[PDB]
Amino acid sequence: GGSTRNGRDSEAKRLGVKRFGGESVLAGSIIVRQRGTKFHAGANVGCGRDHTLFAKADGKVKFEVKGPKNRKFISIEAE
Amino acid sequence: PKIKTVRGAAKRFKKTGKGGFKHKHANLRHILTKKATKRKRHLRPKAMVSKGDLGLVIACLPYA
Amino acid sequence: GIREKIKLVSSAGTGHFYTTTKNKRTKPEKLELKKFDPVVRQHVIYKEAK
Amino acid sequence: GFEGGQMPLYRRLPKFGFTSRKAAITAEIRLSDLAKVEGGVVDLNTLKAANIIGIQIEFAKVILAGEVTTPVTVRGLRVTKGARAAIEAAGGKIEE
RNA sequence: UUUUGUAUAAUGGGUCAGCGACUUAUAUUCUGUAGCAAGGUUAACCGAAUAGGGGAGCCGAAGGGAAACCGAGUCUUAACU
RNA sequence: AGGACCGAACCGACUAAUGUUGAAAAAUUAGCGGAUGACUUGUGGCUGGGGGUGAAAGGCCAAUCAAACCGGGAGAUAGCUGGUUCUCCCCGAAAGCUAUUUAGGUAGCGCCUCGUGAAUUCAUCUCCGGGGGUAGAGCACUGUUUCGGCAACAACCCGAUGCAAACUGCGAAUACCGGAGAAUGUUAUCACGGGAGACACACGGCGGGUGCUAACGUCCGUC
RNA sequence: GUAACGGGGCUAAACCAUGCACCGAAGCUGCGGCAGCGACGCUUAUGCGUUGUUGGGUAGGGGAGCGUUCUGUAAGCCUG
RNA sequence: GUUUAUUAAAAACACAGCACUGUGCAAACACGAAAGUGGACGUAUACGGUGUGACGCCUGCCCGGUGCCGGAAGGUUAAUU
RNA sequence: AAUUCCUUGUCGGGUAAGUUCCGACCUGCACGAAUGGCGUAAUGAUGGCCAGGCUGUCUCCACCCGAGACUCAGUGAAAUUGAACUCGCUGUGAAGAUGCAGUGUACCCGCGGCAAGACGGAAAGACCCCGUGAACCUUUACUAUAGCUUGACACUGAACAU
RNA sequence: CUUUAAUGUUUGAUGUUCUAACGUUGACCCGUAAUCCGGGUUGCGGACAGUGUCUGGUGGGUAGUUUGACUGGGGCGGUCUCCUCCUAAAGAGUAACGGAGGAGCACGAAGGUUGGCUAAUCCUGGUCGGACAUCAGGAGGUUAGUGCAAUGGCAUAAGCCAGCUUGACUGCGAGCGUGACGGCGCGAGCAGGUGCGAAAGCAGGUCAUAGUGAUCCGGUGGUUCUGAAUGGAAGGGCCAUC
Ligand SMILES: [Mg+2]
Ligand SMILES: [Mg+2]
Ligand SMILES: [Mg+2]
Ligand SMILES: [Mg+2]
Ligand SMILES: [Mg+2]
Ligand SMILES: [Mg+2]
Ligand SMILES: [Mg+2]
Ligand SMILES: [Mg+2]
Ligand SMILES: [Mg+2]
Ligand SMILES: [Mg+2]
Ligand SMILES: [Mg+2]
Ligand SMILES: [Mg+2]
Ligand SMILES: [Mg+2]
Ligand SMILES: [Mg+2]
Ligand SMILES: [Mg+2]
Ligand SMILES: [Mg+2]
Ligand SMILES: [Mg+2]
Ligand SMILES: [Mg+2]
Ligand SMILES: [Mg+2]
Ligand SMILES: [Mg+2]
Ligand SMILES: [Mg+2]
Ligand SMILES: [Mg+2]
Ligand SMILES: [Mg+2]
Ligand SMILES: [Mg+2]
Ligand SMILES: [Mg+2]
Ligand SMILES: [Mg+2]
Ligand SMILES: [Mg+2]
Ligand SMILES: [Mg+2]
Ligand SMILES: [Mg+2]
Ligand SMILES: [Mg+2]
Ligand SMILES: [Mg+2]
Ligand SMILES: [Mg+2]
Ligand SMILES: [Mg+2]
Ligand SMILES: [Mg+2]
Ligand SMILES: [Mg+2]
Ligand SMILES: [Mg+2]
Ligand SMILES: [Mg+2]
Ligand SMILES: [Mg+2]
Secondary structure, three states: OOOOOOOOOOOOOOOOOOOOOOOOOOOHHHHHOOOOOOOEEEOOOOOOOOOOEEOOOOOOOOOOOOOOOOOEOOOOOOO | OOOOOOOOOHHOOOOOOOOOOEEOOOOOOOOOOOOOOOHHHHHOOOOOOOOOOOHHOOOOOOOO | OOOOEEEEOOOOOOOOOEEEOOOOOOOOOOOOEEEEEEEOOOEEEEEEEO | OOOOOOOOOOOOOOOOOOOOOOOOOEEOOOOOOHHOOOOEOOOOOOOOOOOOOOOOOOOOEEEOOOOOOEEEOOOOHHHHOOOOOHHOOOOEOOOO
């Protein structure tokens, strides 16, 4: 055998889908590792150490797709 | 007979303005060389129990 | 482990100090490299590192 | 406190000690009191005999609780600039 | 009764009559109820004994800080942010 | 003479049967060994319990022995098993997560009950806004396969053909999150506090790991 | 020991398609009655009429009661 | 010869015989906080402990490990000062 | 072999036929020299094997004599027991049915007798596991200690030499 | 009075002797027409032995106990915390003694910033150059490279080179994610001070996700917080830290 073990939660995922109330600085999209699974853009960015899509100034969320060969990109428009 | 308070707990909790108990944070008196200076900074200020363990301190500290 | 622990004392008379590690073997010389101790409220050199 | 087998909580959190040894004698008087001390001069004692402080007590603070009206003179007691205020107006004098 | 589940071939009782198991003391916290109310209430004791006297003392009207201390603020920090 | 020989008394127990609610809490019957000896027996005395005594079996020490009997500490402790007694009315679980010298125990949370507060809270449906890589499919990639081909048997490459939980240049149903709106629902919703029980679940449908796409098998998700 | 439709027995009392009728539950309805909650019609210790709805239940929570022995009310009241 | 009184009488225990080892007597050893007593009114041809078990022929090699006996030079080492 | 797993080893003897027995071999799974090795007359309610004699041990049971059992009179128990109007088969079912479904057979009740079932009676399974259970036992488990030992200071003093 | 010998002291030792504590289970006397006991004489011994307190050793002779859980019964074996992928049904989350691998670190630069740079592979040509070192050209396009697993990600590179450097700063922190909890994580922005850039600006450690241990009891440094009559101090608190 010699097989088993396994990591834990590490949740990681979108916690602010579509236009949301978007607090002054909600989470939005954790999904660590992800530098490109979701990209920083607009009135939100940050992209913390663990690539956590920050989310600056409060407001609706966008979720787009632009230049550099598709690319996700998360931005937040004000309500 | 007057209930005996859990001497120990009475040295880690301090009843606040209301129910709240106010307590000290763990991980700030051992192996710190390899710890985030931000982690410790966000550890110095002591700050109360969680209502889920609260009912486990007001039964430990009868005369609080 | 091997990576011994190290303390960086302030060059200033102040007693404040910093803490980190270093490979006592590979690098013989002791680490010196400045920092900022709240006391003097100013940046300054930091010595001592085996 | 027995939280199953796992280490308790009153055993998981550190302990911050050190106790007064001076607060037990350091009392806290209130505006409501003051003139309630029967007559003038709110002395170090008097309050004690006025069943409002307690023997052992050695020190005490004036502090604002509300009342004051009647002009009074506190003797040998501490007071806040927010209490020494609400008193001199309604008439009064601080020891010192 | 115990079980996911018993007509169970799982437990217990041959039957009847009597007896047989959440009490009691103190402390503490809620709810209900009554008294009084920023006040409430005495303990031991005296006793004219369930009265009345006794307010020693306890709880509450102030909290924050490890504390010194400050006080409707106060710790944190050089800091009013 | 002899721990000598045969054999009663006497001492003992090798075999068998009968007895097994016995005549008997170990005997009766027919046999059996020893029978001047380390023999056997009467009376009385001495060794005391973690102690005695023992030609040694843990054997005996009053039908009791891997630590006697009696009284006391004593209502030891029992996370174990059992039991728990009159009546009507309302609501109504769980067999789960996490930690545990924990696993048939317990604690926090989840779920029940009671009370106090609070708002278009909450729910279904229609519409609008989202992320999706599962089903299926595909084969550029990562591997894996066939048949041709150009190639000192066969690499790459081209064409044609399949396969994949840990392949994806594609990609649903739908579940989930949010916004709007009507209607219906005895605020179903949230928070604080009094009281809990419960952490052995079983089968059946659907998606699966394990097993033999065996089991009234086993382990998850979901109704 | 028939025992591989429950049985009898069935050539349709099997099977397929279409259609009507009937049987069938503590479901739904009808009638009489009970209690928790809501509304309205009257009525205002309110308490009723109608009327809407709810009332399977272990662990367990909540709310109502009955009866037994004893003390006061008991020199009362019942009793040869 | 002895033994599991009450499922085991035996190859088990014992035994004469053998050996190792202790003991100089106020013996070793043992019962006993102690006094004292047993050993023994014996005294190494005696007494204890341990293993083997008439007798016959015999009883090989290994001292590294553990124990026991001897040694003291050195290393380390308690209370104490 | 009281030691041998393979194993009924192989060979010889005994028998009509021998996983046992006796004699050998040696490949001793894993004998061996006083937790003695190999022998041994005698002894043994000791283990194994063989033969004569003997027989109801058996082929294969028959008859007979007595004590019960059976009938009568007297006295007079027991365990067990939720309640009984207590049948068979096939199936169902907490998975092995007198009690459920279907069906079959059967007038009511004793007495002698036999034990297939009532998972019959009997002991809160001793096996197995479980309990942060117990007890005795062992040791280079831990931690302690009686005893046995070491030194120091006391009780404990005086002289001379180095 | 500083370096060095004889006398006397005091003092340890070693070694002889003595007697006078102490031993006598040698003899004799007396209490006593007693083997006990006591006293006396004598002999032998003698500061020894022996006992008390303290102390090192030995100490199953004796005593109290411990000697884990999961587990397709138990045991044997294996496992026990953390990280990666799948199982996991397109949000999160999930089981098995399911299928596979990793961590218990490394780095004063491998951190920060600024300026610049861009691979593998093959084809052809070129001294020694060999299948494959280095040079040229072409093709090619994340097939390379990320300090170490796997997954996601990376050209505006998070890959590579170099200059100057210490932001691997200190006090805080709107608002979030994730937990039963202890707790862990992300974070713009504020204050004080830094580094690099001309500047906008970036920097509170490394592409991210493992690389860890609560509490207690103490150790070290700082501080006028406390300091049991007062002043101090010991101890305690607070901050840093082992
Ligand atoms: Mg008073
Ligand atoms: Mg069962
Ligand atoms: Mg039954
Ligand atoms: Mg009864
Ligand atoms: Mg004889
Ligand atoms: Mg006989
Ligand atoms: Mg004889
Ligand atoms: Mg006798
Ligand atoms: Mg007996
Ligand atoms: Mg007791
Ligand atoms: Mg009891
Ligand atoms: Mg533990
Ligand atoms: Mg598919
Ligand atoms: Mg899903
Ligand atoms: Mg459990
Ligand atoms: Mg379970
Ligand atoms: Mg389940
Ligand atoms: Mg099942
Ligand atoms: Mg009809
Ligand atoms: Mg009907
Ligand atoms: Mg009901
Ligand atoms: Mg004999
Ligand atoms: Mg016997
Ligand atoms: Mg016998
Ligand atoms: Mg022997
Ligand atoms: Mg022998
Ligand atoms: Mg033979
Ligand atoms: Mg042998
Ligand atoms: Mg020998
Ligand atoms: Mg049957
Ligand atoms: Mg019979
Ligand atoms: Mg039985
Ligand atoms: Mg049992
Ligand atoms: Mg022991
Ligand atoms: Mg004990
Ligand atoms: Mg276990
Ligand atoms: Mg998911
Ligand atoms: Mg990395």
